[PDB]
Design a protein around this ligand. Structure first.
Ligand SMILES: CC(=O)N[C@@H]1[C@@H](O)[C@H](O[C@@H]2O[C@H](CO)[C@@H](O)[C@H](O)[C@H]2NC(C)=O)[C@@H](CO)O[C@@H]1O
Length: 314
């Protein structure tokens, strides 16, 4: 049979995210992706950060990429990473890799993308992003994705962690009746060294290890352990003198923030069910700054027959 092909799509080419008068922390652009995605098996996004000769904002910054929903105009976070300290991603020839297959329905035709870095220096960060589309035979011909929650405009725009009440994490999701497979895609990272510290002088939410929970129809169904990823083993090991090696809770400097995939029960199909993201209980005493969990959680619906995006309500 004709060999299944892989197409590479180049979009951002050495774009700069920076902070300054005539500068911008984000860069957006429209790129042409093939129109038909019915045979797309995988899409890999590669982010190359060019930071030669300490020419960039040397801090380990929060950064992310979005695809625009052509009809609603809403930006969906397709990938998130923390810039390495001092250097770029040169240690990785193709750059940081994040699977964005879940968004194949949005990556068709002239598609608008946005890349942001929470950079506060004019030096900023420079990137080049390309995508590999691998065609073959996906088990499901059609897919639809919609965000359940997105508190991710920046690290400090994440959900405040440790306050008396934490609202905005509960929604209702309505899956199409023709849904054959459904699952959640979640990306969460913590900011801050808020007190009280955990043993080991670990403040929240950057350093304190936590396991969060997703409850479906009130039943605790999935668990998200934000533990040690093994930052010392990071291939981008040229980050010193920055504090790159110790483990943060669920992330590392110079590494993509992990994508958590939770497969929903087929009994949920053709139903509206409750979704609730619950952070592990903690109370900020407010003596050492804030704590925030930048989070985006999407629900993907797949079927061999055309499927509309699931409906999310409060
Ligand atoms: C990924 C991560 O958590 N990075 C931290 C940065 O966010 C910190 O930078 C500080 O970020 C806040 C919020 O954007 C700014 O208000 C603050 O000015 C900025 N501070 C500096 C010195 O750039 C950073 C420093 O605390 O620590 C990590 O890099």
């Amino acid at each position: 049979a004709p060999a299944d092909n892989t197409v590479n799509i180049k979009t951002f080419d050495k774009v700069k995210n920076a902070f300054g008068d005539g500068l911008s922390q984000s860069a957006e652009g429209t790129f042409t992706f093939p129109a038909d995605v019915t045979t797309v098996k995988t899409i890999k996004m590669f982010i190359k950060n060019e930071c030669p000769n300490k020419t960039c904002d040397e801090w380990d910054r929060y950064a992310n990429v979005y695809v625009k929903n052509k009809t609603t105009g809403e930006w969906y976070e397709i990938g998130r990473f923390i810039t390495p300290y001092w250097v770029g991603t040169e240690k990785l020839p193709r750059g940081l890799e994040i699977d964005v297959t879940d968004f194949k329905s949005l990556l068709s035709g002239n598609t608008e993308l946005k890349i942001y870095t929470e950079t506060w220096l004019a030096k900023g960060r420079e990137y080049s992003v390309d995508f590999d589309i691998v065609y073959g035979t996906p088990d499901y011909k059609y897919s639809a994705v919609v965000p359940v929650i997105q508190y991710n405009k920046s690290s400090i725009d994440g959900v405040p962690y440790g306050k008396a009440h934490t609202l905005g994490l509960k929604k209702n999701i309505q899956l199409p009746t023709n849904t054959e497979k459904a699952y959640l895609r979640t990306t969460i990272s913590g900011w801050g060294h808020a007190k009280p510290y955990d043993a080991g002088s670990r403040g929240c939410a950057e350093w304190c290890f936590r396991t969060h929970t997703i409850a479906i129809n009130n039943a605790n169904t999935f668990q998200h352990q934000l533990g040690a990823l093994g930052c010392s083993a990071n291939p981008i090991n040229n980050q010193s003198p920055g504090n790159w090696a110790p483990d943060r809770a669920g992330w590392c400097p110079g590494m993509a923030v992990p994508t958590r995939i939770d497969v929903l029960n087929n009994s949920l199909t053709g139903s509206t069910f409750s979704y609730e993201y619950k952070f592990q209980s903690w109370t900020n005493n407010g003596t050492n700054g804030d704590a925030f969990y930048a989070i985006s959680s999407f629900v993907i619906a797949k079927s061999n027959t055309p499927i509309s995006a699931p409906v999310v309500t409060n």
